[PDB]
């Protein structure tokens, strides 16, 4: 099991649409304890995004339907999906805490993995109750904030990762904390700082930075009303 072998496996898995495999491959790769390359890193993240992304979508479907006598079936099912979603997120957080974040040597990746830790705790927050929920919401924000402090020290305002952090962190406020004024504030700031440094935009990724900028604008102009 070369690292090269595992990566081909994952690239195939991806091609085949078996994302539990693609994730298991990258989780294997990650457990060899070397800093992931950018590509290695980007697969793990895509793999896991699709894995959990299917339970999130499924959960929503089952919760939409729940909102129609012996409905304790919707509930017993929801909780199965939820239990499963919690295990995927704990995988990724164990990985982030044990390997990705400590093995991270450089701004671009330190932020990326802290954003991801924010994401996954946010995902847990969607299905969490009581004490658990307060701990989740709070570790989500705490990870988002640490990535942002570092992105502000170390990256252009136009950096896709940094823009992508602002985007996710803004939604964290809107959807999870239910603080829209803050979601907007956090987003106008991130937008305005990017549109100031327009000369910094590199043609070499201009379309990505400008993509996420339009995403940011989207949410604002929706969110104002």
């Amino acid at each position: 099991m070369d690292k090269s072998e595992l990566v081909q496996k994952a690239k195939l898995a991806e091609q085949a649409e078996r994302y539990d495999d693609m994730a298991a491959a990258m989780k294997a790769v990650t457990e060899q304890g070397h800093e992931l390359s950018n590509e290695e890193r980007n697969l793990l993240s895509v793999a896991y995004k699709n894995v959990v992304g299917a339970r999130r979508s499924s959960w929503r479907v089952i919760s939409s339907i729940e909102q129609k006598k012996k409905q304790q079936m919707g509930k017993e099912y929801r909780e199965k999906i939820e239990a499963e979603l919690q295990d995927i997120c704990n995988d990724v957080l164990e990985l982030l805490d044990k390997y990705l974040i400590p093995n991270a040597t450089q701004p671009e990746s330190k932020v990326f993995y802290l954003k991801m830790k924010g994401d996954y705790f946010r995902y847990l927050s969607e299905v969490a109750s009581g004490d658990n929920k307060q701990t989740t919401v709070s570790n989500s924000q705490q990870a988002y904030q640490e990535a942002f402090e570092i992105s502000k020290k170390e990256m252009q305002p136009t950096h896709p990762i940094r823009l992508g952090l602002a985007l996710n962190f803004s939604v964290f406020y809107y959807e999870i904390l239910n603080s829209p004024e803050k979601a907007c504030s956090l987003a106008k700031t991130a937008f305005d700082e990017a549109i100031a440094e327009l000369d910094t935009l590199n043609e070499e990724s201009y379309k990505d930075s400008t993509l996420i900028m339009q995403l940011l604008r989207d949410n604002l102009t929706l969110w104002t009303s």
């Binding site: 890193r41 980007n42 697969l43 993240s45 895509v46 995004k49 992304g53 954003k115 994401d119 896709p160 990762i161 992508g164 985007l167 996710n168 803004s170 939604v171 964290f172 959807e175 990505d208 993509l211 996420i212 339009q214 995403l215 989207d218 949410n219």
Partner: peptide
């Protein structure tokens, strides 16, 4: 793909 890898909370 970086954009894909960044699972954007989306548009």
């Amino acid at each position: 793909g970086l954009l894909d890898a960044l699972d954007l909370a989306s548009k």
